[PDB]
Amino acid sequence: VRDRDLEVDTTLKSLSQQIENIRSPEGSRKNPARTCRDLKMCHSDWKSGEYWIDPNQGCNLDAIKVFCNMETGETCVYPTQPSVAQKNWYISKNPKDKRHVWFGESMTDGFQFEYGGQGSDPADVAIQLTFLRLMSTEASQQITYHCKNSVAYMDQQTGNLKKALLLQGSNEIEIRAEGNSRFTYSVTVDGCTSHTGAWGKTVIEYKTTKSSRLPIIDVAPLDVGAPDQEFGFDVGPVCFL
Amino acid sequence: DRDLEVDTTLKSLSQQIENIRSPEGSRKNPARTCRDLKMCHSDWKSGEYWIDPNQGCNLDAIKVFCNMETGETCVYPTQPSVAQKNWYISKNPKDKRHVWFGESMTDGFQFEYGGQGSDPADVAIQLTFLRLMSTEASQQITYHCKNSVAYMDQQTGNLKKALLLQGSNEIEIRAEGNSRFTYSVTVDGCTSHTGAWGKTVIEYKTTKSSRLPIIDVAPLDVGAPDQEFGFDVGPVCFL
Amino acid sequence: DRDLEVDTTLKSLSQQIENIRSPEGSRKNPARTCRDLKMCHSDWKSGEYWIDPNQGCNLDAIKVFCNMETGETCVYPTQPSVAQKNWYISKNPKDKRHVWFGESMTDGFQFEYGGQGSDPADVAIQLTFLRLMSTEASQQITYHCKNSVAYMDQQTGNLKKALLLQGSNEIEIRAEGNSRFTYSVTVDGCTSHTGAWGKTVIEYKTTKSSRLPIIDVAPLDVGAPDQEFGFDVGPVCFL
Ligand SMILES: [Ca+2]
Ligand SMILES: [Ca+2]
Ligand SMILES: [Ca+2]
Ligand SMILES: [Cl-]
């Protein structure tokens, strides 16, 4: 028989701690917070890093593992597969005709990008993203196009953007190099501007208040088709602030 | 003895906390959605539960059918059964005007959901939240007909006399045309005028869950005094 | 002995659990919306409460007026009162052009809400949630006018000089046109140039609540140095 007083005092501390964990979750997997923005706001001193969150609440078994930037409050959700190998992915029955073709939708062994990490169910994560968009004022994502004999953005020969690749946003919105300036991506470095027989890369960013457009789920290069034209991707996380 | 009052309180506090972390789906402790109940209690089975998708005060919680195989929350119409009779006499046998039951017929009404004496405005907020917490929705509706084509016309072999449906965000769902705004038909017993009762069963299923539930129906083959219809309106189910 | 200790701790735990299930709407224990407060505590009085519709951490709670007769949550502009003076001088008698106070006039600014020293980005997220939990929203604005038509022009009897409103959604709200996007007026003392102050009181009410609150105003009948105006901006109210 357990000593009664110590048992009661132990239950009391445990009940008190259970209530505290409801009020102030620590962002562990058993005890996930709502967003990184909430963690930051409520815990000024906590360090940037990995935390679990459950923005759609209810049952917490669908919580997602994310990086919180505690300087900015950003919640960053990683694609399930950050890295797409660098190789030839497509040969057209017509080398000379350069046209946009979707990696995920039309290329042998292509896939549309998924988010959350290898354990997750995408339908659950889609619900989580919906709540994250609701709890943020903007979102941003970066993607790197790795290139060998493949223009990504600016064509050095012509000086124009007509061979630039297309991105597919999350709600059937294309994001482009040109056009309406609220649907256009920006480019920080562009090492793909000519065919050199060597590898370069172009780094592309989209930031918007219309967070329904992110993340990116597909990429359509144009300057592809000939058999020595190779590319690959590093897909960054979609970050909500 | 006498102070196991304390053990009772401790057990009750512990249970109140558990009901918060993981609601049982009772009226007192409603869960958020059937999806959450299935997720948190994998051994629980299909049937009626109380949910509160919009949280806050729990007094506007709604009683639903949870399909615990799929995770669907199924929200019933307040009046599933609509009487079978002549609802409409036109100045005509121009039996080829769509006329809304709810917006236009005498004693017609647009369909409400939630059951009990739910307040429809509370329930609209709940449906708003169920849409956020699901990826698709579907709904079935039965058209009972007496001398009234529903979908296919045996005479002409075509759909030009098909009824149309109104969705929740005012979208019109039709027999033909764009694949996205199109309803399907499982059984079609309304194809000719025979003096007897028949029925036609219709489904719509979509990822644009704003379009559901159905709030109105506009038959076309109505107007003469010998033409009668009714409905069974199924639940709107969110997955 | 020290059952004083134990029963005091049991009470405190029972209370903290209560505060989570039924927040009181204080700054430390904010409720979700006024609607929820009314629903759960029908005896509570209209007044100032703190709410946190977006939940998570509660430090971004906003202070609101709850109308406990209606269930309305009213969120006040940070600066309800905009001074009455000449704000804009054109190269004019043209005319007769809409000029946005916020986007275009010197010293003009778009309207922020939440007050205290809230962060507009935080309040915008709260309004997103307020909109999800409400069926309807309204707001009233007063245009104080000296030699400036706001709505009806008495020399013409037309609304062609009526000011424009900018809603939160972008979305212009206008005197005329499609009826879902028009404002109404309950007072119009601006119909002629008298050299004295008058005012026009405008209201917009909609189920499409992402159009509210109003964030900017474009008068048309401005541009000369003798033309002056100011605003009293009402709360945006949600139900
Ligand atoms: Ca969850
Ligand atoms: Ca509720
Ligand atoms: Ca909050
Ligand atoms: Cl929520």
Residue numbers in the entry:
A (entry chain A): 6 to 246
B (entry chain D), C (entry chain E): 8 to 246
Quote what the paper states about this structure:
Inside the cell, within the endoplasmic reticulum, the C-propeptides (also called COLFI domains) play key roles in determining correct chain association during trimerization, notably in cells producing different collagen types.
The overall structure of the homo-CPI trimer strongly resembles that of CPIII having the shape of a flower, with a stalk, a base and three petals. Residues 30–76 form the base region, which is particularly highly conserved among the different fibrillar procollagens. The main difference is in the orientation of helix-4, a relatively long α-helix in each chain whose ends are involved in the inter-chain interactions thus forming a central triangle in the trimer. The only example involving the CRS is the salt bridge between Asp129 (CRS long) and the highly conserved Arg42 situated in helix-2 in the base region. Instead, homo-CPI seems to be stabilized by interactions mainly involving residues in the base region.
